[PDB]
Design a protein around this ligand. Structure first.
Ligand SMILES: [Zn+2]
Ligand SMILES: [Zn+2]
Ligand SMILES: [Zn+2]
Lengths: 111, 46, 147, 65, 270
């Protein structure tokens, strides 16, 4: 009847960029980022790594509604540490750890 | 001439047209099955 | 799952949990008494039919019927029953041309949507041709379905 | 009406176990529980897929069309 | 998170099982990995069925549904063009696999139609995909349907590339066991009991891989979640070790794609 298309769970639509970064007004050095077509499978990683960065004052996320594959991320950092770059660092960090995960598994598997 | 329908209770095809009577030539039944279209039918396996 | 509402596993639904098959049957009769008017079954034409419905007849065969497997949805006509123009007092036939071929066809219920399963053509004890059509469609558990 | 390809809760293919399942019950004469175990059906969410299956298709094939 | 983390240890392994001890990782990653294996790994499966002949008991779409759930060799799925990105009309050998099914009740006895009876028509181009996964010791891969003497079934199938988010038919994970903190030391759960929780609750098999907590111990509030016990299965379309590796690759690509997006925006910014 009126069920949504399952493609809308991960494929970007028309006028839908992957990320949208807005600036918060409730606090200094804080931004809110919208992840389109992306649930907390990835989102939870991002928060976790952000909270391992001692220069980050706030990192949290929420999925406003399960009907839509969207993810809100709020980041607040200390003075000078542009939150956007903080996120970029978190991504680099996560990938590096995943690289090792793969390598260690492949080795362990071979043995 | 044209397969319009197939006898019931018997695989025998009738191919009878209007006014030819619904009675099955080789059974006496009066059921008549239209038979699956010649057109291929696509289903979304999904 | 706040009240009597529930949370169902979509992956399970995908695999086939509580999936069901729905059938519906339609039917119609040949005619009444041939008092200068008879009724029959035959594919109608937009320009050669009077008071034609606002659906479609292009899925019908020569006799106004649809072979099994054909996908028929919404207002689509399934039984091309015809009944001659009756513009006169006696409510019978009349000496007209294009509008002489007035129809009286049967379509699917506007909410239905499936394919033709089986078509039966018989006669009653009065020797009147009788058409009966069975259609089917799959019902997949929605967020408004009751369990 | 034929055995569901894949367990509803897992996706574990059980559509190739029905035939051998029946053999375990007939040819070997095993308890249904041990038969399911012999099929590798560890999780009860997969055991039920066979344990409570109703083979209706055998009845449907008794008709001649 | 800087490489010196994930210590992968394998306890047991088989064609469809990898029993892990993944230590020195963030719980978020342990779970994220679990999730990405469940629903973000591309596989091959029948996503379209043409019914030419069907005089069988089962409904046309009933059968089509069943066909879509049959696991197909997906070893080289990464070499198959994702259908949504395939510029070529309808479908082609570069983005789809065509299989056919032909059966007829030659015998008076019940004829069984098996997945092993599917025949690949399209050009695989040497790619290891499309082959119906048969793990039946009798060779009779998945029973599609039963068939009466006078009945006939003729189908044409088109398999495509996809992920479980689109439909469960695409998943290869099957089931993933996942547990941490065998002994309830982190107090992430409060055991329900009617007398003695130590006796009422079954001791997990993973408890043998960690020293028991002492009653003289104080709550180690500094302790974090770590050492995750996992057991990944496979439906057979993808070697269980590839299920895990490819799951990991997927996450790297996902993070990389949002990293790329960040880069793209910075490139577009002044
Ligand atoms: Zn006959
Ligand atoms: Zn199960
Ligand atoms: Zn193509």
């Amino acid at each position: 009847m009126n069920a949504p298309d399952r493609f809308e769970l991960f494929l970007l639509g028309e006028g839908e960029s992957k990320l949208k970064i807005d600036p918060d007004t409730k606090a200094p050095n804080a931004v809110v980022i919208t992840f389109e077509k992306e649930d907390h499978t990835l989102g939870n990683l991002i928060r976790a790594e952000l909270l391992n960065d001692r220069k980050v004052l706030f990192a949290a996320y929420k999925v406003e509604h399960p009907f839509f594959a969207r993810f809100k991320l709020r980041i607040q950092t200390t003075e000078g540490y542009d939150p956007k770059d903080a996120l970029k660092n978190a991504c680099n960090s996560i990938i590096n750890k995943l690289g090792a995960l793969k390598t260690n598994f492949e080795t362990e598997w071979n043995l | 001439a044209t397969l319009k329908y197939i006898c019931a209770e018997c695989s025998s095809k009738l191919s009878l047209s209007r006014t030819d009577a619904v009675r099955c030539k080789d059974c006496g039944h009066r059921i008549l099955l239209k038979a699956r279209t010649k057109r291929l039918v696509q289903f979304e396996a999904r | 799952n706040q009240e009597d509402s529930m949370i169902m596993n979509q992956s399970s639904i995908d695999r086939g949990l509580f999936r069901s098959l729905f059938f519906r049957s339609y039917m119609d009769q040949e005619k009444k008494y041939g008092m200068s008017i008879t009724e029959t079954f035959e594919k109608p034409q937009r320009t050669n039919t009077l008071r034609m419905k606002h659906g479609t007849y292009d899925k019908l065969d020569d006799d106004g019927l649809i072979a099994p497997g054909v996908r028929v949805s919404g207002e689509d006509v399934i039984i091309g029953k015809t009944t001659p123009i009756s513009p006169d007092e006696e409510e019978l036939g009349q000496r007209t041309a294009y509008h002489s071929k007035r129809d009286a066809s049967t379509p699917l219920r506007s909410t239905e949507n499936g394919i033709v399963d089986q078509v039966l053509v018989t006669t009653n004890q009065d020797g009147l041709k009788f058409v009966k059509v069975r259609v089917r469609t799959t019902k997949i558990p929605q967020i408004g379905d009751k369990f | 009406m034929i055995v569901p390809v894949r367990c509803f809760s897992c996706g574990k293919v059980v559509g190739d176990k029905w035939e051998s399942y029946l053999n375990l019950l007939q040819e070997d004469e095993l308890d249904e529980g041990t038969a399911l175990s012999r099929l590798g059906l560890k999780r009860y969410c997969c055991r039920r897929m066979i344990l409570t299956h109703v083979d209706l298709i055998e009845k449907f094939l008794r008709y001649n069309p | 998170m800087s490489e010196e983390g994930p210590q992968v240890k394998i306890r047991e392994a088989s064609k469809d099982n990898v029993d892990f001890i993944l230590s020195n990782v963030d719980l978020a990653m342990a779970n994220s990995l679990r999730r990405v294996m469940i629903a973000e790994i591309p596989t091959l499966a029948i996503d379209s069925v043409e019914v030419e002949t069907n005089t069988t008991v089962l409904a046309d779409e009933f059968i089509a549904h069943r066909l879509g759930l049959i696991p197909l060799q997906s070893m080289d799925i990464e070499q198959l063009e994702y259908s949504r990105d395939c510029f070529c009309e309808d479908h082609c050998d570069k983005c789809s696999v065509v299989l056919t099914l032909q059966a007829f009740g030659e015998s008076e006895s019940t004829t069984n139609v098996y997945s092993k009876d599917l025949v690949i028509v399209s050009n695989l181009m040497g790619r290891n995909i499309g082959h119906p996964i048969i793990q039946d010791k009798e060779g009779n891969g998945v029973l599609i349907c039963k068939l009466r003497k006078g009945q006939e079934l003729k189908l044409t199938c088109v398999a495509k590339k996809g992920i479980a988010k689109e439909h469960a038919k695409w998943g290869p994970a099957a089931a993933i066991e996942f547990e941490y903190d065998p002994w309830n030391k982190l107090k992430h759960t409060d055991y329900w009991y009617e007398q003695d929780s130590a006796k009422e609750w079954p001791q997990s098999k993973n408890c043998e891989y960690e020293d028991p907590p002492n009653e003289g111990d104080p709550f180690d509030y500094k302790a974090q979640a770590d050492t995750f016990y996992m057991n990944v299965e496979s439906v057979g379309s993808i070697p269980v070790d590839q299920v895990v590796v490819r799951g990991i690759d997927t996450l790297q690509k996902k993070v990389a794609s949002i990293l790329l997006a960040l880069t793209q925006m910075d490139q577009d910014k002044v």
